[PDB]
């Protein structure tokens, strides 16, 4: 599902990432990847906040 | 392991295709079915 979607997302005549079955992606990042990682870590702690306050 | 050996190729020969898709799908199905086994065991 999501994994086949992402592997099909970028397969053209342009540079691709090092994503595969296993191993590790090479450290060299791309703009959208870094942005999405930032947004994810962003929303994580923010959700933890109201997670705590609902028990407060 | 088959998927690992699948990635050793290089050059123009890195094409993604139906075989890779089916390996992905069977891995997913194995995971989901063993999870079903877990729930029906518990």
């Amino acid at each position: 599902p999501r994994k086949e979607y992402e592997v099909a997302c970028n397969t053209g005549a342009y540079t691709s990432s090092g994503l595969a079955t296993a191993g590790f992606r090479t450290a060299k990042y791309l703009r959208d990847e870094w942005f999405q990682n930032s947004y994810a870590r962003y929303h994580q702690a923010f959700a933890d906040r109201d997670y705590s306050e609902r028990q407060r | 392991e088959c998927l690992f050996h699948r990635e050793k190729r290089m050059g123009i020969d890195l094409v993604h295709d139906e075989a890779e898709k089916e390996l992905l799908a069977e891995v997913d199905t194995i995971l989901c079915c063993q999870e079903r086994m877990r729930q029906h065991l518990d």
Binding site: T11, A13, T15 | L14, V15, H16, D17
Partner: peptide
């Protein structure tokens, strides 16, 4: 980074 077609 490659499709079957090309």
């Amino acid at each position: 980074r490659y499709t079957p077609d090309d």
